[PDB]
Amino acid sequence: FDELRIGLATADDIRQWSHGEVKKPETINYRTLKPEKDGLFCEKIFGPTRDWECYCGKYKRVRFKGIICERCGVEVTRAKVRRERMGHIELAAPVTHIWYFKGVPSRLGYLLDLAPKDLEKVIYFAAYMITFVDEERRTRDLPSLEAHVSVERQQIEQRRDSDLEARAKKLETDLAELEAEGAKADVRRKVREGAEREMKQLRDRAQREIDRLDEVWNRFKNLKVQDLEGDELLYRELRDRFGTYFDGSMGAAALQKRLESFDLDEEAERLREIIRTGKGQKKTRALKRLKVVSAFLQTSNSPKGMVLDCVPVIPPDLRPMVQLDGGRFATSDLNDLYRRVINRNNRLKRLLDLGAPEIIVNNEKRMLQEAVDALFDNGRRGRPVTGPGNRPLKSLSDMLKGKQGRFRQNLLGKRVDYSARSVIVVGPQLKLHQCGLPKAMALELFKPFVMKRLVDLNHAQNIKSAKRMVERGRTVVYDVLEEVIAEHPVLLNRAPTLHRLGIQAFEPQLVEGKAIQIHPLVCTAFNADFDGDQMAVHLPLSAEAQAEARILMLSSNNILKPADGRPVTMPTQDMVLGLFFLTTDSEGRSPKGEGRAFGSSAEAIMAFDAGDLTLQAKIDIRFPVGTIPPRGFEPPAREEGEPEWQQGDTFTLKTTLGRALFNELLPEDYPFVDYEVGKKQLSEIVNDLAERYPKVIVAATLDNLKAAGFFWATRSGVTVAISDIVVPDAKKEIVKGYEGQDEKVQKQYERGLITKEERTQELIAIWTKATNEVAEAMNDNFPKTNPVSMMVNSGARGNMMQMRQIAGMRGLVSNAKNETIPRPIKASFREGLSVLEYFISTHGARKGLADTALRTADSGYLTRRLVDVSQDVIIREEDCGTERGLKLPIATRDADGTLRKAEDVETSVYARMLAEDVVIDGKVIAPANVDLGDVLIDALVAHGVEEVKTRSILTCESQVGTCAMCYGRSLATGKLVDIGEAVGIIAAQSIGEPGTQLTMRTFHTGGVAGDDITQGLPRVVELFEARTPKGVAPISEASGRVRIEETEKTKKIVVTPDDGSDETAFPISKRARLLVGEGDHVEVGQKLTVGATNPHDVLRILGQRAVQVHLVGEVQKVYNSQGVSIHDKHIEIIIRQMLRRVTIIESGDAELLPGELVERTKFETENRRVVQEGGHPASGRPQLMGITKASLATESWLSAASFQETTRVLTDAAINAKSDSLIGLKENVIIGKLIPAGTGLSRYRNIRVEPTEEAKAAM
DNA sequence: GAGCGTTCAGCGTTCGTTTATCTCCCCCTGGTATAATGGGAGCTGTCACGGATGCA
DNA sequence: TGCATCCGTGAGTCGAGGGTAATAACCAGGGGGAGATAAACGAACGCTGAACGCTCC
Ligand SMILES: [Mg+2]
Ligand SMILES: [Zn+2]
Ligand SMILES: [Zn+2]
């Protein structure tokens, strides 16, 4: 397995594969149910239906295999061969592949200079083509053919003379005869009028005969090849009057002749000349055409593969005529489609054999061509072959396409054995690395292991007897089962699996019932609540696989989210509420026994048990040896004339008993914490522990926090009641005052002084102010000790506006299609809405449910496309060779006489390693090649340096993937990233995981469309696809004087650049709403108006570094608007992938095509060779292209095919004949090989293990 | 030797065998002699994006 | 050269489950495999005892 070469299969190649030929539409005898002879399913060609049995019944036995029975010709072998062996159909008349024509023009290519409308006419028997002309003959014998037409021309003139003479005589005779009789007044005039009408008809006929004769002669003189000829009658006149000079034909046979006579090298030369000297769209037509035709000359394969002579047939097992229970049958649709082409081909042979006309044979050839088209791609032309009428028939390409196609349903994602499923429940008594596994569930998973142990322990005699024992479920099995599951991990998994913490290994543990017990800390990583949520269970089998589940995927080595290095295994609903009550100051209750001194922390618990002391009360408490005091307590000490070291001996401390209890959970070396804990400070110490302490201590401490948190949440006494939710007393008055304020506007609208649209905007603003005022009144009313406020202030769950609409008024509600009602909701859910208030509220509620389902769909699509472009980024080098970094602002917005750090320093500059040292006083503070952390960043801001240059993923110069140093330290582990990690897949998941969480839109459009640029997930998708924004704001090229022209038709902005350079004229919309002053200076980087900057022009003018800054900054503001935090390295990896290619312009010396994407590294190599060759280098300019476009233009056709396009990529790969080297990730999942990422690397997988000599010496 | 005692023997003597004849329905093909001479028929509304393809 | 049009592609995740319709119709001939009765050999038996030995008077 080294390369998956693909190309065009020629006619001889198809015959070579075949082990026979299908000659009938027969499938199976209706009575015996056995395959027929020389039809579909035939055993002579495909293989024997039963193992080693032939068709006639001779040679049934297994002995004489590998022979051919002389009776029926069946070769005895295994029945499985039917899945491999394939046949072929011979076609009487050639047909043309539906793929290579009838598609996009990058695959058909205009290889013959014919329009698709032209092709439709010729191959479907509606117009002729002149496949060949004897242009030399025509010149040599020209006077003879000229002599024949000239004498032929004479005859019409002689005939015209006589008919006209008779016409002249006829007019003279009838007028004269009538006038002698004189029967009426005007006999001569009426008949002469009739007579001249007859002359006109004869004269008109004379025009038809001469002009038709003229028309047939002039088509001779334009008898160039590939000339379509629409009029069938005219062709017959050409053909009958003269043969042996022009050769004409119809259909796919004509095309085959044209490709035979093609001289493709000369066509390429003339196409190159047009590219060398051409203008307008004429150059582009030659440019696209060059792409297809050049591929044919370089490749050995001939173009004749377009027109197939023999149709291969799928092996019978892949299109099964399976018996169905109940005596019915089940057949695959390929049989029906294969039946039609066999039927129509067979009839064509009959029609050709006897003498038949052209009309009848053409219709059969037309139907044969249509039948083959339906087989390869049903529905690419007209109506599909519906068969039963209820549904389109499946087709060859239909199996290779879409979400349900072979690629995306049976090669990337398969169903698996040794797997299970069940609902999940919460078990608090578990440890972090433990899960409950139901008895019955585990028994069916571990059935092979239980059977092996049952035999060894002699409870079961043999393998079949062991099988029977477990199926019955005898008592002995359960004892054996607990023995075998121990120390054997199982991989839990929830269904959406957005990010890599979706799959986590656990140590199983048997539990009765039928629901998987799970650990409450790990819920948010799975995103699992306990409404009802089935979770799949997989079992790792081999020694390598289960080793991976213990080390890599365990649930205790995954404390930190890889997105931003934030804790994920301390959720907050109950635990955080408990700890908040436990560590809070007095006055939360009656602080009994406060302001006293206690002998030891034990004695305080004694006082608490008696009830004198309370848990939340300030007290003086002593402290045993070894407990570190606060960091600010280290300089001060007790009063003594001697030096003292209070850091690890006795010390009193002003605190509360609860804080003393809480600290005992933390490890002994940890300094004391004396403040109320909340949620933010709680997350901090878990993050602090993960940095400075080993992994085992972090996992153990969380369990202590879980137990203490749950215990005190019970004792905290949070509840809900009708008297707990207290409505603001002031509220009623506040609402009435606004109503009176409102009503004057209503009054002054009745008199017509204000338009309704202006009134709606002014009322919404008035109501919005009202909601804030009643919120403030309510916030003041509530006491800090009540339940509802306590569980929001603590950060447990909920938000302020949610609490507002339970007690205070809900406020304005968004009407359908983003409008506001003028009459907001005045009642609270406690007070109970009215009927009409409830109806209007539904408009927003249902819309939110429908929209949320859509955002999941789009976020899933965004993640999938991101993964393709972001793969092939693997850490494959310890350290890069280079010095180029990126300059980031550590500190900004510094008020006068003080230094203020940057607001987003964590996501931006943390966990990066300095490209070069930093000197401010002439001395290095932070040396180079040191990753930045809390301590180092503090050093730099204290000394006052305002920027830093950190090495980063963009400027990495690694020939394969990215080095470890440029990526900097990872975030899920807090150490330098390991070699072989797949940073690419990690980055894609991190961007896509909070996509569902975004859900942001303009609150109200205001009645204007286009003023507000795309927000949220559409904006993210727009940024990553390189799409020009909906609201586009132009960019200044350089300095100069700018001014505005307010033309009536449309607005306009014209800027006169300084230094005499060429004028530049910018257009704008009529509602431009610009902001720059008139006749004033402009700079290079500013944007002229409000909107969203176009990423392409920022690349064009500013530079590659600037567009990197722009893209990372733009997408981050979407995320930071909500509250999610993604470290900039994750963004940077994807943006690195977009800038990789380069667009070549003026491709004279590089010798490849102009104006197509080419990767940067190949461009550099080709230029280096050409200057070595003496030729001047070809230029290139950087080009940014979307994640979709970047993914498709990859070297590996197999990975590209497994992406969105599965026809175009297959079609052009066949033309280009691209051998797929199998290096990569997606394509190594298709074949079943080991992915080059992590343990699959050459370096990690090839190691060897031997003991030491001292180990052998002992035993 | 008497009288009967075991056991090859080759030889008949038809019965053993498999192997040769010979009589029968599904299955395929061909043929009807007034005159008869261009389909029914099922649709249709997502959404954005882009690039080919037509045409003023 | 620009503007107008249509065509192709993609659009989440795991759960639950099995059947679809309609019009000249016949002798007439005749082939071709699928099931029904006498001839070639050798093996059970068959009396043929005959031809050998095994004990007994
Ligand atoms: Mg749920
Ligand atoms: Zn056979
Ligand atoms: Zn590097």
Short mmCIF file of N, CA, C and O in Angstrom, two decimals, chain A residues 758-804:
data_model
loop_
_atom_site.label_atom_id
_atom_site.label_comp_id
_atom_site.label_asym_id
_atom_site.label_seq_id
_atom_site.Cartn_x
_atom_site.Cartn_y
_atom_site.Cartn_z
N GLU A 758 -41.43 56.94 13.39
CA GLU A 758 -40.70 57.68 14.41
C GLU A 758 -41.26 57.41 15.80
O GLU A 758 -40.51 57.30 16.76
N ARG A 759 -42.59 57.31 15.91
CA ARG A 759 -43.24 56.99 17.18
C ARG A 759 -42.82 55.63 17.71
O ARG A 759 -42.62 55.47 18.92
N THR A 760 -42.73 54.62 16.83
CA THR A 760 -42.31 53.29 17.26
C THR A 760 -40.89 53.32 17.82
O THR A 760 -40.62 52.68 18.83
N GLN A 761 -39.99 54.05 17.17
CA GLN A 761 -38.61 54.10 17.64
C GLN A 761 -38.52 54.82 18.99
O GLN A 761 -37.80 54.38 19.89
N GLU A 762 -39.22 55.95 19.12
CA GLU A 762 -39.24 56.68 20.38
C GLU A 762 -39.93 55.90 21.50
O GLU A 762 -39.55 56.06 22.67
N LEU A 763 -40.95 55.09 21.20
CA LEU A 763 -41.60 54.34 22.28
C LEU A 763 -40.73 53.20 22.78
O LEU A 763 -40.75 52.89 23.98
N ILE A 764 -40.03 52.52 21.88
CA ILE A 764 -39.17 51.40 22.26
C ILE A 764 -38.06 51.88 23.18
O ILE A 764 -37.73 51.23 24.17
N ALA A 765 -37.49 53.05 22.86
CA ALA A 765 -36.49 53.67 23.72
C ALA A 765 -37.08 54.04 25.08
O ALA A 765 -36.40 53.92 26.10
N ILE A 766 -38.32 54.55 25.10
CA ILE A 766 -38.96 54.88 26.37
C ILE A 766 -39.19 53.64 27.21
O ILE A 766 -38.91 53.63 28.42
N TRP A 767 -39.68 52.56 26.59
CA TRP A 767 -39.91 51.31 27.32
C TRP A 767 -38.62 50.66 27.80
O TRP A 767 -38.61 50.05 28.88
N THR A 768 -37.55 50.71 27.00
CA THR A 768 -36.27 50.11 27.39
C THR A 768 -35.74 50.76 28.66
O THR A 768 -35.18 50.08 29.53
N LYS A 769 -35.89 52.08 28.78
CA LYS A 769 -35.48 52.80 29.98
C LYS A 769 -36.29 52.34 31.19
O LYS A 769 -35.76 52.27 32.31
N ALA A 770 -37.58 52.08 30.99
CA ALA A 770 -38.47 51.63 32.06
C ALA A 770 -38.05 50.29 32.65
O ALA A 770 -38.17 50.09 33.87
N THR A 771 -37.62 49.35 31.81
CA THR A 771 -37.20 48.04 32.30
C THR A 771 -35.99 48.14 33.22
O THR A 771 -35.88 47.40 34.20
N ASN A 772 -35.04 49.00 32.88
CA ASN A 772 -33.87 49.21 33.73
C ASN A 772 -34.26 49.81 35.08
O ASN A 772 -33.68 49.45 36.10
N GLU A 773 -35.19 50.77 35.08
CA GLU A 773 -35.59 51.43 36.32
C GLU A 773 -36.25 50.47 37.29
O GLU A 773 -36.04 50.55 38.50
N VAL A 774 -37.10 49.58 36.78
CA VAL A 774 -37.77 48.64 37.67
C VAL A 774 -36.80 47.55 38.12
O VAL A 774 -36.96 46.98 39.20
N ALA A 775 -35.80 47.23 37.29
CA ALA A 775 -34.73 46.32 37.70
C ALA A 775 -33.94 46.87 38.88
O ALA A 775 -33.65 46.14 39.83
N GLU A 776 -33.57 48.15 38.81
CA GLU A 776 -32.80 48.77 39.89
C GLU A 776 -33.59 48.82 41.19
O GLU A 776 -33.02 48.64 42.27
N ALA A 777 -34.89 49.12 41.11
CA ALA A 777 -35.73 49.15 42.30
C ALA A 777 -35.83 47.77 42.94
O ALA A 777 -35.76 47.64 44.17
N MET A 778 -36.01 46.74 42.12
CA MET A 778 -36.07 45.36 42.61
C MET A 778 -34.76 44.90 43.21
O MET A 778 -34.75 44.22 44.24
N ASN A 779 -33.64 45.21 42.55
CA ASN A 779 -32.31 44.84 43.03
C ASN A 779 -32.03 45.44 44.40
O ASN A 779 -31.33 44.83 45.22
N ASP A 780 -32.53 46.65 44.66
CA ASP A 780 -32.36 47.26 45.98
C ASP A 780 -33.27 46.62 47.01
O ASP A 780 -32.90 46.53 48.18
N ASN A 781 -34.47 46.20 46.60
CA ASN A 781 -35.45 45.64 47.53
C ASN A 781 -34.97 44.34 48.13
O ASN A 781 -35.13 44.12 49.34
N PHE A 782 -34.48 43.43 47.29
CA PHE A 782 -34.14 42.07 47.70
C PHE A 782 -33.05 42.11 48.76
O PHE A 782 -32.08 42.87 48.64
N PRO A 783 -33.14 41.29 49.80
CA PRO A 783 -32.03 41.15 50.74
C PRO A 783 -31.06 40.09 50.29
O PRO A 783 -31.39 39.18 49.53
N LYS A 784 -29.81 40.25 50.73
CA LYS A 784 -28.74 39.37 50.27
C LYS A 784 -28.88 37.94 50.79
O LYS A 784 -28.26 37.04 50.23
N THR A 785 -29.72 37.71 51.79
CA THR A 785 -29.82 36.40 52.41
C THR A 785 -30.89 35.52 51.79
O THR A 785 -31.02 34.36 52.21
N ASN A 786 -31.66 36.01 50.83
CA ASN A 786 -32.75 35.18 50.37
C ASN A 786 -32.23 34.20 49.32
O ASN A 786 -31.17 34.43 48.74
N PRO A 787 -32.93 33.08 49.10
CA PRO A 787 -32.47 32.09 48.10
C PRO A 787 -32.28 32.56 46.67
O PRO A 787 -31.27 32.21 46.06
N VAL A 788 -33.25 33.28 46.10
CA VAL A 788 -33.25 33.58 44.66
C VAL A 788 -32.05 34.43 44.27
O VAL A 788 -31.37 34.14 43.28
N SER A 789 -31.76 35.49 45.03
CA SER A 789 -30.56 36.28 44.78
C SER A 789 -29.28 35.51 45.06
O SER A 789 -28.29 35.69 44.35
N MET A 790 -29.26 34.69 46.12
CA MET A 790 -28.04 34.01 46.55
C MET A 790 -27.49 33.07 45.49
O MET A 790 -26.27 33.00 45.29
N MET A 791 -28.35 32.37 44.76
CA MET A 791 -27.87 31.41 43.79
C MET A 791 -27.55 32.04 42.45
O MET A 791 -27.13 31.33 41.53
N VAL A 792 -27.74 33.35 42.30
CA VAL A 792 -27.29 34.08 41.13
C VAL A 792 -26.03 34.87 41.43
O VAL A 792 -25.13 34.95 40.59
N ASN A 793 -25.97 35.49 42.61
CA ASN A 793 -24.78 36.23 43.02
C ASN A 793 -23.58 35.30 43.15
O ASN A 793 -22.46 35.67 42.80
N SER A 794 -23.81 34.10 43.67
CA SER A 794 -22.76 33.10 43.81
C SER A 794 -22.24 32.55 42.49
O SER A 794 -21.22 31.86 42.50
N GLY A 795 -22.92 32.80 41.38
CA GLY A 795 -22.52 32.19 40.13
C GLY A 795 -22.98 30.77 39.93
O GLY A 795 -22.45 30.09 39.05
N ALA A 796 -23.91 30.29 40.76
CA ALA A 796 -24.38 28.92 40.65
C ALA A 796 -25.07 28.65 39.32
O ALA A 796 -24.63 27.81 38.54
N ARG A 797 -26.10 29.43 39.01
CA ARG A 797 -26.93 29.22 37.83
C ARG A 797 -27.86 30.41 37.71
O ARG A 797 -28.25 31.00 38.72
N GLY A 798 -28.23 30.76 36.49
CA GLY A 798 -29.10 31.89 36.28
C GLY A 798 -28.35 33.16 35.96
O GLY A 798 -27.12 33.20 35.87
N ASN A 799 -29.14 34.21 35.74
CA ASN A 799 -28.63 35.51 35.36
C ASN A 799 -29.62 36.55 35.85
O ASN A 799 -30.73 36.21 36.27
N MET A 800 -29.18 37.80 35.87
CA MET A 800 -29.97 38.87 36.47
C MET A 800 -31.28 39.11 35.73
O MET A 800 -32.33 39.29 36.36
N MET A 801 -31.24 39.16 34.39
CA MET A 801 -32.45 39.43 33.62
C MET A 801 -33.47 38.31 33.75
O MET A 801 -34.67 38.55 33.60
N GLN A 802 -33.02 37.07 33.96
CA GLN A 802 -33.95 35.98 34.23
C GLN A 802 -34.66 36.20 35.56
O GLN A 802 -35.86 35.95 35.68
N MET A 803 -33.92 36.62 36.58
CA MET A 803 -34.51 36.94 37.87
C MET A 803 -35.42 38.15 37.80
O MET A 803 -36.38 38.25 38.58
N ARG A 804 -35.12 39.10 36.91
CA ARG A 804 -35.97 40.26 36.73
C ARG A 804 -37.38 39.89 36.29
O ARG A 804 -38.36 40.32 36.89
#
